[PDB]
Amino acid sequence: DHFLEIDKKNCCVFRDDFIVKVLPPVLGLEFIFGLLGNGLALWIFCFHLKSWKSSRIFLFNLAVADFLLIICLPFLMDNYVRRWDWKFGDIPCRLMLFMLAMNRQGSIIFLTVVAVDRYFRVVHPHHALNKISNRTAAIISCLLWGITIGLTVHLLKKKMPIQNGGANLCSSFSICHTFQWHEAMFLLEFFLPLGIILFCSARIIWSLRQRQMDRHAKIKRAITFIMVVAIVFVICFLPSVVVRIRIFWLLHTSGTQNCEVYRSVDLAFFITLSFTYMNSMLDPVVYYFSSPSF
Amino acid sequence: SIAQARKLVEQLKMEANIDRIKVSKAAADLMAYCEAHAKEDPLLTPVPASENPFRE
Amino acid sequence: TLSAEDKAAVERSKMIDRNLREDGEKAAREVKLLLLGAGESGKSTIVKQMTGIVETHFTFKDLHFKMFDVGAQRSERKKWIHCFEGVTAIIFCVALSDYDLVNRMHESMKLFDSICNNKWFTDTSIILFLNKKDLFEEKIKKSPLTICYPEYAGSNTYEEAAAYIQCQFEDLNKRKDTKEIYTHFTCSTDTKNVQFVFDAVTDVIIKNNLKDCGLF
Amino acid sequence: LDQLRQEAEQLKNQIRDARKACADATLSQITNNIDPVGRIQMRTRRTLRGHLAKIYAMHWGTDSRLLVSASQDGKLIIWDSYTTNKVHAIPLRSSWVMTCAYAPSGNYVACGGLDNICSIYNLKTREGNVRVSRELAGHTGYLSCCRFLDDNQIVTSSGDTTCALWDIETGQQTTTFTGHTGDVMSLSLAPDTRLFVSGACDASAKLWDVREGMCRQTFTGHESDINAICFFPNGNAFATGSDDATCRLFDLRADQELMTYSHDNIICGITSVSFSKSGRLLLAGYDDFNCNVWDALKADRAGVLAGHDNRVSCLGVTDDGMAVATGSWDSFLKIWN
Amino acid sequence: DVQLVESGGGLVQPGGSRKLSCSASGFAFSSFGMHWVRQAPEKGLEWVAYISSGSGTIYYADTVKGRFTISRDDPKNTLFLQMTSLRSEDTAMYYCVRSIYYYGSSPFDFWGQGTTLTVSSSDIVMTQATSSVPVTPGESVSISCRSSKSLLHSNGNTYLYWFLQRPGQSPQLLIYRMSNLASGVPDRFSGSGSGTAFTLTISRLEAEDVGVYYCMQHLEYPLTFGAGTKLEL
Ligand SMILES: O=C(O)c1cccnc1
D176 CB near a chain E CB, below 8 Å? no
Query: Sign of the CA dihedral A171, A175, A176, A181?
Result: positive
CA distance C138 to C146: 15
Confirm if D261 and D221 have CB atoms less than 8 A apart: no
Cis peptide before D91 (omega within 30 of 0): no
Residues of E within 8 A of C8 (CB-CB) are: 33, 52, 57, 101
The domain over range C33-207 is classified in CATH as 3.40.50.300: yes
* Interface touch C83/D83, C-beta < 8 Å: no
Cβ-contact A159, A95 below 8 angstroms: no
Q: Is C40 on the interface with E (CB under 8 A)?
A: no
Cα E33 to Cα E98: distance, rounded to the nearest angstrom: 6
Per residue, the 3-state secondary structure of chain D, as one string, reads CHHHHHHHHHHHHHHHHHHHHHCCCCHHHHHCCCCCCCCCCCCEEEEECCCCCCEEEEEECCCCCEEEEEECCCEEEEEECCCCEEEEEEECCCCCEEEEEECCCCCEEEEEECCCEEEEEECCCCCCCCEEEEEEECCCCCEEEEEECCCCCEEEEECCCCEEEEECCCCEEEEEECCCCCCECCCEECCCCCEEEEEECCCEEEEEECCCCCEEEEEECCCCCEEEEEECCCCCEEEEEECCCCEEEEECCCCEEEEEECCCCCCCCEEEEEECCCCCEEEEEECCCCEEEEECCCCCEEEEECCCCCCEEEEEECCCCCCEEEEECCCCEEEEC
Claim to verify: residue E115 and residue E220 sit in the same structural domain: no
φ, ψ of residue C176 to 5 degrees: the values are -75, 5
CA E229/CA E207 separation, integer angstroms: 17
Q: Are D203 and D243 in contact (CB under 8 A)?
A: no
Closest-approach residue (CA) in chain A for C64: A126
Q: Chains with 3 or more CB pairs closer than 8 angstroms to C?
A: A, D, E
How many Cα atoms sit within 13 Å of D243 on the Cβ side? 15
Instruction: Give dist(CA A30, CA D308) in Å, integer.
Output: 40
D61–B contact, CB cutoff 8 A: no
**CA distance, residue C137 to nearest chain D CA (Å):** 38
The phi and psi torsions of E120 (rounded to 5 degrees) equal -70, 180
Amino acid in position A37: G
How many angstroms separate the CA atoms of A233 and E159, rounded?
A: 65
Listed in sequence order, the residues at least 6 apart from D184 whose beta carbon sits closer than 8 Å to its beta carbon are: D144, D145, D157, D158, D159, D161, D162, D163, D198, D199, D200, D201
- Supply φ then ψ for residue A109, to 5 degrees: -65, -45
**From the CB of residue E5, how many other CB atoms can be counted at a distance below 10 Å?**
14
Examine the fold and report which residue of E119, E144, E177 is the final residue of a domain before the chain moves on: E119
- Whose Cα sits closest to atom 5 in ligand 1? A171
Q: What domain range is D295 assigned to? A: 7-336
CB A160 within 8 A of CB A90: yes
Distance CA D57, CA D52 (A): 14
Contacts of residue C152, defined as CB under 8 A and 6 or more positions apart, other chains included, come to: C145, C146, C164
Q: How many other CB atoms are there within 10 angstroms of residue B3's CB atom? A: 8
Q: Which residues of C touch D75 (CB under 8 A)?
A: 20, 23
Angstrom distances, CA of residue A228 to CA of A283, C140, D205: 11, 53, 61
Interface test with C, best of D69, D130, D135, D142 (most C CBs within 10 A): D142
D170 neighbors C62 (Cβ within 8 angstroms):
no
Phi, psi for C175 (deg, rounded to 5)? -85, 70
Q: How far is CA D176 from CA B12, D155, D165, D172, D214, in A?
A: 19, 10, 6, 10, 9
CA distances from D179 to B8, C116, D116, D213, D217 (A): 9, 34, 19, 10, 11
Domain count of the fold of chain B: 1
Residues in chain C: 216
d(CA D107, CA D88): 12
Q: How does DSSP assign A140-157, residue by residue?
A: HHHHHHHHHHHTTGGGTT
User: Which residues does E contribute to its contact with D (CB < 8 Å)?
Assistant: 2, 26-28, 31-32, 100, 102-104, 183
CA gap D20, C148 in Å, rounded: 53
Q: What is the DSSP letter of C81?
A: G
Q: How many CB pairs lie under 8 A apart between chains B and D?
A: 161
The Å distance, Cα A78 to ligand 1 centre, comes to 13
Yes or no, beta carbons of B20 and D255 under 8 Å apart:
yes
Q: For residue A12, give Cα distances in angstroms to A175, A177, B53.
A: 6, 10, 72
Hey, what amino acid is at A256? T
The answer to whether C19 touches D74, Cβ cutoff 8 Å, is no
Of A211, A219, A291, the CB nearest to C214: A291
User: What is the rounded CA–CA span in Å between residue B14 and residue A288?
Assistant: 68
Domain CATH number, residue D156 = 2.130.10.10
Start-to-end Cα distance in chain C: 49
CB D278 within 8 A of CB D233: yes
Rg of chain C taking only CA atoms, in angstroms: 21
b vs e for C53-70, b when ≥16 Cβ sit within 10 Å of the residue's Cβ? bbeeeeeeeebebbbbbb
DSSP assignment string, A168-193: EE--SS---SS--SHHHHHHHHHHHH
Q: Do E53 and C12 touch (CB under 8 A)?
A: yes
Sheet holding D195-199, edge to edge: D188-189, D195-199, D204-209, D215-220
CA angle D284, D285, D287 (to 5 degrees): 135
The radius of gyration computed from the CA coordinates of chain E, to the nearest angstrom, equals: 17
The CA dihedral of A122, A123, A128, A134, to the nearest 10 degrees, is: -30
Residue E223 DSSP class: P
Domain that holds residue B3: 1-56
- CA gap D335, D307 in Å, rounded: 10
- Residue closest to E130 by CA, chosen among E190, E185, E177, E199: E199
Q: Which atom, in ligand 1's list, is nearest to the CA of A101?
A: 3
What is the distance between the alpha carbons of residues A35 and A27, in angstroms, rounded to a whole number?
A: 13
The approach used to solve this structure was cryo-EM
For ligand 1, atom 6, which residue shows the shortest CA distance?
Answer: A171
Residues A87 and A191: their CA atoms lie apart, in Å, by 35
CA torsion E58→E62→E64→E65, rounded to 10°? 50
Q: D79 pairs with which residues across the strands?
A: D67, D86
The chains in contact with chain B, meaning 3 or more Cβ pairs closer than 8 Å, are: D
Question: Do residues D163 and D198 lie in contact, with contact meaning Cβ atoms separated by under 8 Å?
Answer: yes
On whether both E141 and E99 belong to a single domain, the answer is no
Beta bridge partners of A179: none
User: Do the beta carbons of residue E10 and residue E20 sit within 8 Å?
Assistant: no
What is the biggest distance separating any 2 CA atoms in chain D, rounded to whole angstroms? 64
Helix or strand run (H / E) with residue E201 = strand E197-202
Nearest-Cα distance to chain D for B5, in Å, is 6
**Shortest Cα–Cα distance, D140 to chain C (Å):** 7
Rounded CA-CA distance D322/D329 in Å is: 24
For C215, the closest of A125, A128, A291 (CB atoms) is: A291
Assess whether E222 and E131 both reside in one domain: yes
Question: For residue B22, what are the contacts with CB-CB under 8 A and spacing of at least 6?
Answer: D22, D23, D24, D254
What span, in angstroms and rounded, lies between the C-alpha atoms of D326 and D333?
Answer: 6
Domain count, chain E: 2
Task: State the Cα–Cα distance between residues E150 and D142, nearest whole angstrom.
Answer: 54
Cβ neighbourhood burial of D265 (10 Å; 0-12, 13-18, 19+): exposed
Burial of E167 (0-12, 13-18, 19+ CB in 10 A): exposed
H or E segment to which residue E148 belongs = none
Max distance between CA atoms of chain C, in angstroms, equals 85
**Contact status, residue C109 vs residue C168, Cβ threshold 8 Å:** yes
CA distance E133 to E143: 9
For residues D238 and D273, give the distance between their C-alpha atoms in angstroms, rounded to a whole number: 10
CA distance C106 to C167: 14
Nearest to A229 by CA among A275, A274, A260, A198: A198
Give the sign of the dihedral formed by CA A193, CA A198, CA A204, CA A210. Answer: negative
Q: Write out the H or E segment, with its range, that includes residue C36.
A: strand C30-37
Q: For residue A287, which phi and psi values (nearest 5 degrees)? A: -80, -60
* Per-residue CA distances from E224 to E122, E171, E221 (Å): 12, 15, 8
Tallying the residues shown for chain A, one arrives at 294
Q: A97 C-alpha vs ligand 1 centroid, how far in Å?
A: 6
CB contact under 8 A, B43 and D179: no
Question: Does residue C7 belong to the interface with chain E, where contact is any CB pair within 8 Å?
Answer: yes
Helix (H, G, I), strand (E, B), or coil: what is residue E122? coil
- DSSP string covering E3-64: -EEEE--EEE-TT---EEEEEE-SS-GGGSEEEEEEE-TTS-EEEEEEE-TTS--EEE-TTT
Strand partners, E153: none
Question: Nearest CA to CA, how far is D176 from chain C (Å)?
Answer: 18
| Those residues with Cβ within 8 angstroms of residue A242's Cβ, 6 or more apart along the chain or in another chain | A272
Domain boundary among E87, E119, E151: E119
Distance of CA C109 to CAs A29, A136, C74, C100, Å?
A: 60, 46, 19, 14
User: Exposed, middle or buried: residue B19 (CB in 10 Å: 0-12, 13-18, 19+)?
Assistant: exposed
Q: Which residues of B touch D297 (CB under 8 A)?
A: 30-31, 34
**Measured between alpha carbons, how far is residue E227 from residues A175, E46, E142, E143 in Å?**
84, 10, 16, 12
Q: Is D114 in contact with C6 (Cβ distance < 8 A)?
A: no
Ligand 1 neighbours, Cβ below 6 Å, are A 76, 100-101, 171-173, 273
The C-alpha torsion from C181 through C184 and C187 to C192, rounded to 10°, is: -130
How does DSSP classify residue E218? -
| CATH number reported for the structural domain that contains residue E150 in this entry | 2.60.40.10
Contact E119, E86 (CB under 8 A): yes
Beta carbons of C133 and C187 less than 8 angstroms apart: yes
- Cβ atoms D92, D76 nearer than 8 A: yes
CA D139 to CA D157: how far, in whole Å? 9
- Compute the distance between CA of residue A81 and CA of residue A21 in angstroms, rounded to an integer: 7
Q: Mind telling me how many Å the CA of C30 is from chain A's nearest CA?
A: 10
d(CA C149, CA C146): 5
Compute φ and ψ for A18, nearest 5 degrees: -60, -35
d(C-alpha D309, C-alpha D307), whole Å = 7
Residues D147/D154, Cβ–Cβ less than 8 Å: yes
Domain of residue E207, residue span: 126-231
Burial class (CB in 10 A: 0-12, 13-18, 19+), A257: exposed
Report the interhelical angle of A90-123 vs A217-254 (nearest 10°).
Answer: 140
Whole-number Å distance between alpha carbons of A26 and A271:
9
Asked if E102 lies within 8 A of C12 by C-beta distance, the reply is yes
Instruction: Note whether C29 contacts A211, CB cutoff 8 Å.
Output: no
- CA A118 from chain center: how many Å? 20
Amino acid at D27: L
- Domain holding A232, by residue range, is 3-288
